[PDB]
Amino acid sequence: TVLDSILEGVRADVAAREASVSLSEIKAAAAAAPPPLDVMAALREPGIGVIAEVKRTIADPAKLAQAYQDGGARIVSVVTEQRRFQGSLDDLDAVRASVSIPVLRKDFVVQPYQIHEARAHGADMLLLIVAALEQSVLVSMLDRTESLGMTALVEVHTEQEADRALKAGAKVIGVNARDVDRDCFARIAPGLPSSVIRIAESGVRGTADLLAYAGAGADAVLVGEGLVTSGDPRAAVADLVTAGTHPSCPK
Numbered sequence: 001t002v003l004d005s006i007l008e009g010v011r012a013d014v015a016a017r018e019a020s021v022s023l024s025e026i027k028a029a030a031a032a033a034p035p036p037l038d039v040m041a042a043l044r045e046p047g048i049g050v051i052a053e054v055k056r057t058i059a060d061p062a063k064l065a066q067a068y069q070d071g072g073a074r075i076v077s078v079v080t081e082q083r084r085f086q087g088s089l090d091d092l093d094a095v096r097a098s099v100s101i102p103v104l105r106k107d108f109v110v111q112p113y114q115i116h117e118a119r120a121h122g123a124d125m126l127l128l129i130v131a132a133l134e135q136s137v138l139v140s141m142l143d144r145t146e147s148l149g150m151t152a153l154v155e156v157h158t159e160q161e162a163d164r165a166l167k168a169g170a171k172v173i174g175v176n177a178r179d180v181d182r183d184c185f186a187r188i189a190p191g192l193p194s195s196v197i198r199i200a201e202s203g204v205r206g207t208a209d210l211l212a213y214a215g216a217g218a219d220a221v222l223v224g225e226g227l228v229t230s231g232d233p234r235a236a237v238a239d240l241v242t243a244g245t246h247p248s249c250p251k
């Protein structure tokens with residue numbers, strides 16, 4: 001029920017935004033935006049994809065996203081949730097203008113307005129959380145996301161949520177260990193069709209963690225800090241992007 005309380009706040013924030021920017025207007029803004037990038041194609045590229053996250057401290061999310069791209073990130077995740085992470089849609093605009101790689105909107109997405117809104121602000125990918133969405137809503141949200149040319153990162157925490165995600169038509173499934181189930185990805189990944197993209201969203205501290213997820217079948221990992229804390233996010237991302245290739249074999 002606590003999640004209902006959190007979602008009530010999200011629904012209030014969304015409703016207040018819709019009062020200023022109507023559904024008709026946000027649809028017009030979404031249609032006007034440059035088309036979304038082919039996120040599936042990016043996720044199918046060789047190597048483990050690094051999805052580097054912008055969060056909050058950060059006076060210039062665009063500059064951070066640029067460092068992420070320079071380091072070889074596959075996708076930039078932008079947290080737009082205000083109440084805990086001090087993110088905003090403004091961050092999505094800033095990041096979108098700064099990088100050429102796909103951009104994921106990371107937020108609690110619970111109603112269709114937010115889908116059009118994500119697109120209007122340049123997102124290529126959008127987070128859908130199975131634990132937050134009853135199946136009827138999950139399916140509706142996934143279909144609308146795809147109808148706009150975006151890809152849903154469908155986040156699960158249990159085998160049952162994974163089954164729900166598959167039934168809804170998910171193409172990309174992310175495993176979040178936090179409700180922390182430290183063996184979440186391994187409990188879930190093997191059960192997925194080989195054709196579905198697997199993302200480990202939790203517990204990536206360094207190259208060893210990325211490699212461990214890679215060895216368990218991950219196609220990409222999400223990393224937030226301590227890319228920032230490192231003081232050198234480009235280098236930190238570069239190290240993860242090239243994980244397993246160091247030390248280099250003698251030449």
Ligand SMILES: O=C(O)CNc1ccccc1C(=O)O
Pocket residue numbers: 053055079081085106107108127129155176201224
């Ligand atoms: O990124 C993090 O630091 C914590 N993750 C989130 C932050 C805002 C909205 C949803 C999530 C989630 O993973 O379902």
